[PDB]
C-alpha cells in the first residue's frame, strides 16, 4: 500500500544529527575489533559499527578498546567508524515479545514487524541476593508422567535435562511448553506460565519446525523464542542465553511466572571457548577457559523464586546439556550439575529400547522435589517411587515392569495432573498386575479416555482439592475396577 | 620522583619517550625551545645519507651514536635534547625517533589548546561557507582553544558534510540520511 | 493477493530509492547553526 510508506516512516524518521563520540577501527580479526578512540566508553557498553553491526566494549585498554562483534566480522574494515550508544548491553523486555521470534539482540526475525517494547533490561544483571528469594513451593507442571511424578519441578527451580544426542531433550522442553496452555487459558492468573525457548547452536530449520509445533498447538501466543543458530557468530550464541534470561527476569520481577529453556548450554560453552581461545586466553580442561563455570553460573543463578515482598514471581530454568557417549563426569556436565537443582538423565539404552521418554529414574533427581508437588500426585507417586526402587533393586518384578511401561508417553501429549494421577493410581494399586504387560499402554489409553469422557466430575474434584480424598479414592477405585471388568 | 603528566597521553615507545621529554621540559619551562630542537633534529635525520648511517643494523651502536654526538655537538643542542638522542641510541630505539618527535608535536598542540577538526564534503568547498562553518565550529570549544580545521573532500557522500571535532562527530551527509530513510522504509 | 502486494511494495521501495539514486547546502548551514546553539 502506497501511503504505508509515507505513513510516518518519512515524517517520523529520526533524521536528526547529533554530536556523537566515535572511535576508529584499528584491526578487525577473530571476531574482535581493536578500536582507536572512544575515550568515554564504558566497560560492557554497546557500540555500533558503520555497517549497522553492534558490539560490546570488552577490553578497555589504555590505547585502544577491544570490541566483541555481535555478527560477522566480514562487514567490518579497518578505518570504520564506531559510535557509542551510552547504554550497557541490554535487550527489549515486556509482554510484546510473546509470540515473537527474535535473535540474541532482540530483533524480530519472524517478519511480523518490530517489537513494540517500551522497556529495556540489561543482559548482564546480577541475580537476586539471599533475602529476595524464598523456597520453591508451587509446582511447575510438565505434563509428562515420569517427570511430574518422580522428578517434580517447582517454580523458581533449575532442572538440568542432560543426555546424549537424539534422546528427547528438546521433546521434553517442548511438551513442558505445550502443557502450560491449560493454565494460560484458565482464570487463575497465578498459574499462568510464560515460556521462553533460547535456541543456541541449533539448526535453523529445526528452530523453524519448533516454532511450527508451537503454533499448531497454539503455544506461541505465550512463548518467546530467542534464536542464535549454528551459522550465527559465536558472540551471538554467547549472548542469547542472557537475552532470554532478561526477557524472563521481566516476568520474574513483575509478579508473574516465566519458564526458560536453554537448548543447549553445551553449545554456549563451545562458543565461549571459541571466543576465549581467539582472545589468547589460557585454556584449562578440554581447552575450556577458566571461567566457563562462571559463564554458566551467573546465568543459572538468575532463575530464582522471589518472596511476596519482591512480587512473588519466579523464573524456572531448564538448561539442556548434551553428553558424549553417556559420560556425565565430563567438565561442562559436572559444572552445570554443580549449578542446577537436579537432573533428568535421558539414556540411549532406554531410548533405543522403545522406552520413551527415556528418563533414568535411578539417576534423575530433584533436590527441591517434594516441596513442589500436589497432594494427590504425592500420594500416588510416593508409592510408585518406592515400588520402582524395589523393582530396580531386583533387576516385586512384575509390578515394576507394569509401572515402567505405564511411564511411557507419546510426543506432544502432555497430560493434566488429574489424569496422570488417575493413570498412576490404576497402576500402583495393582489393577493391572495380572494384565500382561504389552497391552498396558492400550489399556492406559482406553482407560483415560473413559475417565475423561464420562467421569469429568471426579477429575474436577481432584483439580479443585489438589488431593485425592477417601471419597474420591473409593470413587476412582470403583471406576477403575468397573473399567477393568469391561476391558 | 614525581612526573608531569601531559594533557594528552600517547602510547608505545614513542609515547613513553615523549612523555619523558615533556615531563622533563615542564620542570624547567623549556617546551617550545625543545620543540624547535626536535624539529631541527627531525630534519637532521630525514636527509637520506646519515639516515642510512643510523638505520644501518650493521653499525656498532658506538659508531652510530658517535656520529650522533658529533652532529649534536655541531648545532649547540640543549643538554635535554642531546640526552634524549643519546638515550634513543643507547636503547637502540633510534629509528623510531621521528615518531617520538611526532608524539611531542601532538602533545604540545593540546598544550597550546588546539582541536583538530575535519570536514569532509562531496564538493570542493566554497571559501565563504568554509569560514562560515569555521565561525560555527568556534562556539563549541572553551576559550584558549584553536581550530586546526582541515577540510578534505570525498564526492561519494552525496552531499552534506561530515565534521569531526577531535573524536566528536557529526554526520550531516546525505548518503547516510538516504540509508536511514531506506532502513525506516524497510523496517 | 497479499503476496503480490508485498512484492509490489518491495519493488516500489527499491525503485523509489533508485529514483533518489538518480537525484544546495543551505540545510547544512542551518544544521551547523543548530549545533552551534547546542554549544
Amino acid at each position: 500500500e502506497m501511503s504505508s510508506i509515507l505513513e510516518e516512516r518519512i515524517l517520523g524518521a529520526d533524521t536528526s544529527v547529533d554530536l556523537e563520540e566515535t572511535g576508529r577501527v584499528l584491526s578487525i580479526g577473530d571476531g574482535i575489533a581493536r578500536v582507536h578512540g572512544l575515550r568515554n566508553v564504558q566497560a560492557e557498553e554497546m557500540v555500533e559499527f558503520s555497517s549497522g553491526l553492534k558490539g560490546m566494549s570488552l577490553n578497555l585498554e589504555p590505547d585502544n578498546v577491544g570490541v566483541v562483534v555481535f555478527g560477522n566480522d566480514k562487514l567490518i574494515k579497518e578505518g570504520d567508524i564506531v559510535k557509542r550508544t551510552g547504554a550497557i548491553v541490554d535487550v527489549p523486555v515486556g509482554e510484546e515479545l510473546l509470540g515473537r521470534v527474535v535473535d540474541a539482540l532482540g530483533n524480530a526475525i519472524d517478519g511480523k514487524g518490530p517489537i513494540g517494547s517500551k522497556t529495556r533490561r540489561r543482559v548482564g544483571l546480577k541475580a537476586p541476593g539471599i533475602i529476595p528469594r524464598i523456597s520453591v513451593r508451587e509446582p511447575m507442571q510438565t505434563g509428562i508422567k515420569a517427570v511430574d511424578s518422580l522428578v517434580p519441578i517447582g517454580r523458581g527451580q533449575r532442572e538440568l535435562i542432560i543426555g546424549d544426542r537424539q534422546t528427547g531433550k528438546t521433546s521434553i522442553a517442548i511438551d513442558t511448553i505445550i502443557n502450560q496452555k491449560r493454565f494460560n487459558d484458565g482464570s487463575d492468573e497465578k498459574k499462568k506460565l510464560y515460556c521462553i525457548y533460547v535456541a543456541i547452536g541449533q539448526k535453523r530449520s529445526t528452530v523453524a519446525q519448533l516454532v511450527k509445533r508451537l503454533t499448531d498447538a497454539d503455544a506461541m501466543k505465550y512463548t518467546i523464542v530467542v534464536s542464535a543458530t549454528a551459522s550465527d557468530a559465536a558472540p551471538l550464541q554467547y549472548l542469547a542465553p542472557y537475552s532470554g534470561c532478561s526477557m524472563g527476569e521481566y516476568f520474574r520481577d513483575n509478579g508473574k511466572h516465566a519458564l526458560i529453556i536453554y537448548d543447549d548450554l553445551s553449545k554456549q560453552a563451545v562458543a565461549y571457548r571459541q571466543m576465549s581461545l581467539l582472545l589468547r586466553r589460557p585454556p584449562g580442561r578440554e581447552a575450556y577457559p577458566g571461567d566457563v563455570f562462571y559463564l554458566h553460573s551467573r546465568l543459572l543463578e538468575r532463575a530464582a523464586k522471589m518472596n511476596d515482598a519482591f512480587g512473588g514471581g519466579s523464573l524456572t530454568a531448564l538448561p539442556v546439556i548434551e553428553t558424549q557417549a553417556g559420560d556425565v563426569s565430563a567438565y561442562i556436565p559436572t559444572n552445570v550439575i554443580s549449578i542446577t537443582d537436579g537432573q533428568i538423565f535421558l539414556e540411549t539404552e532406554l531410548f533405543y529400547k522403545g522406552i520413551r521418554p527415556a528418563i533414568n529414574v535411578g539417576l534423575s533427581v530433584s533436590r527441591v522435589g517434594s516441596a513442589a508437588q500436589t497432594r494427590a500426585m504425592k500420594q500416588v507417586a510416593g508409592t510408585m517411587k518406592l515400588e520402582l526402587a524395589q523393582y530396580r533393586e531386583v533387576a516385586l518384578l512384575s509390578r515394576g515392569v507394569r509401572l515402567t511401561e505405564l511411564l511411557k508417553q507419546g510426543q506432544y501429549s502432555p497430560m493434566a495432573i488429574e489424569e496422570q494421577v488417575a493413570v498412576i493410581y490404576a497402576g500402583v494399586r495393582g489393577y493391572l498386575d495380572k494384565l500382561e504387560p504389552s497391552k498396558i499402554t492400550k489399556f492406559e489409553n482406553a482407560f483415560l479416555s473413559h475417565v475423561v469422557s464420562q467421569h469429568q466430575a471426579l477429575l474436577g474434584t481432584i483439580r479443585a482439592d489438589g488431593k485425592i480424598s477417601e471419597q474420591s479414592d473409593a470413587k476412582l477405585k470403583e471406576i477403575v475396577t468397573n473399567f477393568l471388568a469391561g476391558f | 620522583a614525581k612526573l608531569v603528566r601531559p594533557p594528552v597521553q600517547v602510547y608505545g615507545i614513542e609515547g613513553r619517550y615523549a612523555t619523558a621529554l615533556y615531563s622533563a621540559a615542564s620542570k624547567q619551562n623549556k617546551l617550545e625551545q625543545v620543540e624547535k630542537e626536535l624539529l631541527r633534529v627531525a630534519q637532521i635525520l630525514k636527509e637520506p645519507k646519515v639516515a642510512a648511517s643510523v638505520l644501518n643494523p650493521y653499525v656498532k651502536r658506538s659508531i652510530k651514536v658517535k656520529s650522533l654526538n658529533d652532529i649534536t655537538a655541531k648545532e649547540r643542542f640543549s643538554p635535554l635534547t642531546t640526552n634524549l638522542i643519546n638515550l634513543l641510541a643507547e636503547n637502540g630505539r633510534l629509528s623510531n625517533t621521528q615518531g617520538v618527535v611526532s608524539a611531542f608535536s601532538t602533545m604540545m598542540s593540546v598544550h597550546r589548546g588546539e582541536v583538530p577538526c575535519t570536514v569532509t564534503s562531496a564538493s570542493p568547498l566554497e571559501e565563504a561557507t568554509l569560514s562560515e562553518l569555521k565561525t560555527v565550529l568556534k562556539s563549541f570549544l572553551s576559550q584558549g582553544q584553536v581550530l586546526k580545521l582541515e577540510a578534505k573532500t570525498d564526492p561519494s557522500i552525496l552531499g552534506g558534510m561530515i565534521v569531526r571535532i577531535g573524536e566528536k562527530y557529526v554526520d550531516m551527509s546525505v548518503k547516510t540520511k538516504i540509508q536511514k530513510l531506506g532502513r525506516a522504509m524497510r523496517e | 493477493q497479499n503476496m503480490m502486494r508485498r512484492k509490489e511494495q518491495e519493488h516500489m521501495i527499491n525503485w523509489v530509492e533508485k529514483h533518489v539514486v538518480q537525484s544546495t547546502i543551505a540545510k547544512c548551514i542551518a544544521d551547523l547553526k543548530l549545533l552551534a546553539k547546542k554549544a
Binding site: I5, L6, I10, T15 | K177 | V16, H19, S23, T24
Partner: peptide, 15 residues
C-alpha cells in the same frame, strides 16, 4: 526539511 520534499516527489513518481 529537505529530504521529505525529496522523498514524496519520488513517491508520486512511483504512483
Amino acid at each position: 526539511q529537505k529530504l521529505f520534499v525529496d522523498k514524496i516527489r519520488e513517491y508520486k513518481s512511483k504512483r
